[PDB]
Design a protein around this ligand. Structure first.
Ligand SMILES: *[C@@H]1O[C@H](CO)[C@@H](O[C@@H]2O[C@H](CO)[C@@H](O)[C@H](O)[C@H]2NC(C)=O)[C@H](O)[C@H]1NC(C)=O
Ligand SMILES: *[C@@H]1O[C@H](CO)[C@@H](O[C@@H]2O[C@H](CO)[C@@H](O)[C@H](O)[C@H]2NC(C)=O)[C@H](O)[C@H]1NC(C)=O
Ligand SMILES: *[C@@H]1O[C@H](CO)[C@@H](O[C@@H]2O[C@H](CO)[C@@H](O)[C@H](O)[C@H]2NC(C)=O)[C@H](O)[C@H]1NC(C)=O
Ligand SMILES: *[C@@H]1O[C@H](CO)[C@@H](O[C@@H]2O[C@H](CO)[C@@H](O)[C@H](O)[C@H]2NC(C)=O)[C@H](O)[C@H]1NC(C)=O
Ligand SMILES: *[C@@H]1O[C@H](CO)[C@@H](O[C@@H]2O[C@H](CO)[C@@H](O)[C@H](O)[C@H]2NC(C)=O)[C@H](O)[C@H]1NC(C)=O
Ligand SMILES: *[C@@H]1O[C@H](CO)[C@@H](O[C@@H]2O[C@H](CO)[C@@H](O)[C@H](O)[C@H]2NC(C)=O)[C@H](O)[C@H]1NC(C)=O
Ligand SMILES: *[C@@H]1O[C@H](CO)[C@@H](O)[C@H](O)[C@H]1NC(C)=O
Ligand SMILES: *[C@@H]1O[C@H](CO)[C@@H](O)[C@H](O)[C@H]1NC(C)=O
Ligand SMILES: *[C@@H]1O[C@H](CO)[C@@H](O)[C@H](O)[C@H]1NC(C)=O
Ligand SMILES: *[C@@H]1O[C@H](CO)[C@@H](O)[C@H](O)[C@H]1NC(C)=O
Ligand SMILES: *[C@@H]1O[C@H](CO)[C@@H](O)[C@H](O)[C@H]1NC(C)=O
Ligand SMILES: *[C@@H]1O[C@H](CO)[C@@H](O)[C@H](O)[C@H]1NC(C)=O
Lengths: 415, 80, 100, 49, 50, 40
């Protein structure tokens, strides 16, 4: 067997878009452009216009629900204490900075500056989001304060305070590592935590393409809008691409055909744009649902699902706002510095088999010990940590050894 | 009125004259709301408007900034 | 357009995953891979569903035989029945029909 | 109460597609197919291709 | 039609990746997520397009 | 909240006293001393 003897704390970044840019298109004005004859001709085609408007409105509404599900998950708003004594830990990077415009933390400021971003057109418009950036920052700050001061208790019922080192001891006990591991190594854990969080900012700042996902959404939406605008100047098999020339240079009776051709072309382009927007919105909604699930399952509680939040044994997580998404900072436990030993399924003493309650049998060559399964800590074999079941014949890999009774010395001393 | 720097509602266009250039005007990020009175308080969000503003019915119609929730603080001590 | 990953490399990934999970248990998904005998890995896995280690070490042969028998029956079950790999063939047929 | 006294180890298959077949179609060649007049006429339609 | 089918295939691939990561790489306690019973382990096998 | 008297069966010993910070003193009752004294 090979049991590690030392560990490393690591922090990993995760980015998930949760929203799009709400938009609407003036269905009649885009196709016609303030012309009575065009509107009269379009009145024949029916109710495509209302269909497109309803679809776009339905798309635009859902973004607010996406943001509401992702972020608005706390009944109240918590506050960080004025004095910060977290047993050696340092949260100055994630907590909001008072002496600063707005209230974004330094990492959030870096994220907002990194992302590169919008105009007025003929019939197009953009609706402002329901929640401003300050409100989202307040939500993230409330979640962060609640998880720092209370733990996971604020996601189930009333918030109950608890010292931070005790919370971290609980979270190690939740992955099969006892409390004394943290309680005897608090300073090293604090140093590794601080160093990892400090390195996160430099890792984000150095690589320019770190985001790579929130930017793609903006780029492709802008490309769709630009090509929709550019589609307006096309002959489409007509005499000219401008209605004024057709109306003036030519009389109506053989001009209705040109107008009809232009109407058909523009309606087709608008319909294709709407369909593409619908598909993209469905994809973004799926991503937002995943982000909300990760929020609820990792920020508000420790997760036992493998590789769901970070690579390693999950510990806890911190949300950070982004221009059109959220950023997670998963904290994980990763072992290191392993060395091998020799094992045995059971220990045969007094003609009976023994099995460990919690841990494995190991030996460094001559003397057998019981240890944990994620941190090499030997212990003398006694009756307290082993249970007996059956004889020695049934088990295959039994070995020859002895198990001590702590009661025997005291009983012999005091008859 | 949507996304209009509404100094020109009467030009932009019976009983509509009551809601055109009324006694109450309040410019927001999403436009400006006619027929609602601004309030310095903050409650939960009824019928939304945009940019963190929700109109409601108290009577009269009031426009106010949204309130996220009740403020709270937990007494955190290193041995409690 | 040809796929980026040939079937041989996909088989190599699957073989690496399989070798890791037989030898090192679930450890190779967390950090460095750690050695552990296979019967002890199954002892861990019985302990992980609320059953003590006694049952496996005293019934090693029975569990091994049942495991081998089930794996053997898998081949016959997926070979004799023609309508087993339905989803893959359905996807291929849908794409071919649309292109046609 | 009821308590089992024996167990059976069983295995079960499960099938999940993970990929499609990559493909591409040239718009101009499909629509026109080696004809300059068709290409010139289609040039007016815009940028659908 | 190709776009819609590709979206469905992407959803299926995401589910397959989740099953791989959660069951091949460790024991899972979600009921009926991997098999019918108390899950023990899993082994992956390749396929033409799955 | 159900408090219990600290004995040697709900606590486990590990290491020395000075390594950990925040330690406080109290006594830990031993469930064997009374019956040991009952059989002098
Ligand atoms: C476990 O790892 C940590 C760091 O990963 C080790 O801490 C270092 O130990 C060396 C040797 O004593 C000293 O330079 C410092 O105490 C630490 N250095 C740094 C840069 O942190 C630690 O010694 C390892 N072993 C144990 C048992 O904890
Ligand atoms: C195996 O480990 C045990 C305990 O960790 C070692 O026993 C002690 O070894 C040291 C150094 O050799 C001696 O000073 C002690 O007196 C030993 N303990 C007792 C109770 O005598 C043992 O030496 C190790 N064997 C190896 C490394 O081969
Ligand atoms: C582990 O493997 C070793 C060999 O790889 C086993 O050693 C053999 O044990 C049998 C016991 O009946 C002996 O008859 C053989 O002579 C041994 N082989 C050698 C080369 O010495 C060992 O028994 C295995 N352990 C368990 C628990 O099965
Ligand atoms: C562990 O110790 C036991 C008890 O001493 C050993 O059992 C003896 O095995 C020899 C082998 O032929 C017999 O002749 C003796 O009669 C056995 N003694 C008893 C009391 O039954 C055993 O061999 C040792 N080694 C193991 C179990 O691997
Ligand atoms: C538990 O079930 C297994 C099989 O499901 C039983 O093993 C069978 O036992 C009978 C009688 O001894 C044999 O004829 C069969 O060949 C065995 N089958 C296998 C696959 O080994 C086992 O006996 C059952 N346990 C109990 C206590 O009855
Ligand atoms: C924690 O307890 C130990 C023993 O229980 C205390 O040790 C005392 O030390 C003083 C002198 O240093 C002696 O006069 C006492 O008899 C010792 N025992 C007791 C019960 O007082 C130790 O002082 C305690 N810790 C602190 C910080 O006072
Ligand atoms: C946390 O780290 C920052 C980094 O600049 C430092 O200024 C601050 O003093 C640290 N916190 C404490 C309590 O020392
Ligand atoms: C650990 O492994 C090395 C080679 O991998 C081997 O030489 C050594 O004996 C092993 N340790 C023990 C205690 O068997
Ligand atoms: C709207 O008009 C007022 C005063 O005329 C002033 O805030 C500014 O000129 C305008 N604001 C805009 C265009 O955003
Ligand atoms: C309260 O409302 C009045 C009138 O709308 C406004 O002038 C004032 O700025 C608001 N705030 C305070 C603090 O008075
Ligand atoms: C009791 O707890 C409350 C918060 O729940 C805190 O405000 C108060 O200071 C505490 N008092 C004592 C005596 O611990
Ligand atoms: C808690 O903080 C106070 C003041 O910051 C300090 O005197 C006390 O020692 C701390 N508690 C522990 C267990 O260190």
């Amino acid at each position: 067997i090979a049991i590690p003897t030392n560990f490393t704390i690591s922090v990993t970044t995760e980015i998930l878009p949760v929203s799009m840019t709400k938009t609407s298109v003036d269905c009649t004005m885009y196709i016609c452009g303030d012309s009575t004859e065009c509107s009269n001709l379009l009145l024949q085609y029916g109710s495509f216009c209302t269909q497109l408007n309803r679809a776009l409105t339905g798309i635009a509404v859902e973004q607010d629900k996406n943001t509401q599900e992702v972020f608005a998950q706390v009944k109240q708003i918590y506050k960080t204490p004025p004095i910060k004594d977290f047993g050696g830990f340092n949260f100055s990077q994630i907590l909001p900075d008072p002496s600063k415009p707005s209230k974004r933390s330094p990492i959030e400021d870096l994220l907002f500056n990194k992302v590169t971003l919008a105009q007025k057109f003929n019939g197009l418009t953009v609706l402002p989001p329901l929640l401003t950036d300050e409100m989202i920052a307040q939500y993230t700050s409330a979640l962060l304060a609640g998880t720092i001061t209370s733990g996971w208790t604020f996601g189930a019922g009333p918030a109950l305070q608890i010292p931070f080192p005790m919370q971290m001891a609980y979270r190690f006990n939740g992955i099969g590592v006892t409390q004394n591991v943290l309680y005897e190594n608090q300073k090293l854990i604090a140093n590794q935590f601080n160093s990892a969080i400090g390195k996160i900012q430099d890792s984000l700042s150095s690589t320019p393409s770190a985001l790579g996902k929130l930017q793609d959404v903006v780029n492709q939406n802008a490309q769709a809008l630009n090509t929709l605008v550019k589609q307006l100047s096309s002959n489409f098999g007509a005499i000219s691409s401008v209605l004024n020339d057709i109306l003036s240079r030519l009389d109506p009776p053989e001009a209705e055909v040109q107008i009809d051709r232009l109407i058909t072309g523009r309606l087709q382009s608008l319909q294709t744009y709407v369909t593409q927007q619908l598909i993209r919105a469905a994809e973004i909604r799926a991503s937002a649902n995943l982000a909300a699930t990760k929020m609820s399952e990792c920020v508000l509680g420790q997760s036992k699902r493998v590789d769901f939040c970070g690579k390693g044994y999950h510990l806890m997580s911190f949300p950070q706002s982004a221009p059109h998404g959220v950023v997670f900072l998963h904290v994980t436990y990763v072992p290191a510095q392993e060395k091998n030993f020799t094992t045995a399924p059971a220990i045969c003493h007094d003609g009976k088999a023994h099995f460990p309650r919690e841990g494995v049998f190991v030996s460094n060559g001559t003397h057998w010990f019981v240890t944990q399964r994620n941190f090499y800590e030997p212990q003398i074999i006694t009756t307290d940590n082993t249970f007996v079941s059956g004889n020695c014949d049934v088990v295959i890999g039994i070995v020859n050894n002895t198990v001590y009774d702590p009661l025997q010395p005291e009983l012999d001393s005091f008859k | 009125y949507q996304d209009v720097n509404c100094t020109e509602v009467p030009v932009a266009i019976p009983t509509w004259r009551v809601y055109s250039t009324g006694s109450n005007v309040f410019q927001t990020r999403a436009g400006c709301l006619i027929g609602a009175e601004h309030v310095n308080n903050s409650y939960e969000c009824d019928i939304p408007i945009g940019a963190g503003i929700c109109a409601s019915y108290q009577q009269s119609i009031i426009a106010y900034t949204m309130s996220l929730g009740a403020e709270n603080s937990v007494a955190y001590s290193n041995n409690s």
